[PDB]
Symmetry: C3
Subunit: 71 residues, 3 copies
């Protein structure tokens, strides 16, 4: 079920949503919110400041060009 | 091509998917998986625990309120 | 407004996009780009290398199994 709304809401309601985009997907919006968990299966780039409210885990963190595991 | 499915799958299959949402997008699902790379062009907030399986790179990491580049 | 395109673009244009996926969402594409901010309300896993162009903030960072707040 895909509802389009006067007032400007686009609502997709189902069990699973599967997007297969051969080349790319672009989400052009001021803010995107995921209510659950997220997995990224290749890499991540982030331009702006990031806050993690809980602990992060990483094999190493390269800070201002310097190793953290080996500093 | 957008398929809606008895059994509850919503399948969007194309070359590129472009979402232009003037105000916001909200994805309310227990788990979202991206098979490829992801870029976030403003900021990131994450509530729960994060694991990075590979090295991360950052100009600085502010840990429990303390600089890592300058500690 | 949802446009499907010869040439292979799927364009969704509205004020807000709301996805309610009872079980999961999967985005199978080489690259997904968010132009704005992103919040993840549970956890994040990332397989590949991550770059944060700006400072990150975390209560702690567990690097190669070691605490950063308490090392
Ligand atoms: Fe040290
Ligand atoms: Fe130190
Ligand atoms: Fe130290
Ligand atoms: Pt910013
Ligand atoms: Pt959690
Ligand atoms: Pt990679």
């Amino acid at each position: 079920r895909i509802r389009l709304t006067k007032d400007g809401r686009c609502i997709i309601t189902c069990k699973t949503v599967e997007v297969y985009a051969d080349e790319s997907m672009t989400v052009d919006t001021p803010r995107t919110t995921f209510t659950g968990d997220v997995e990224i299966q290749k890499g991540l780039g982030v331009k702006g400041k990031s806050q993690f409210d809980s602990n992060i885990t990483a094999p190493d963190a390269i800070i201002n060009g310097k190793s953290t595991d080996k500093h």
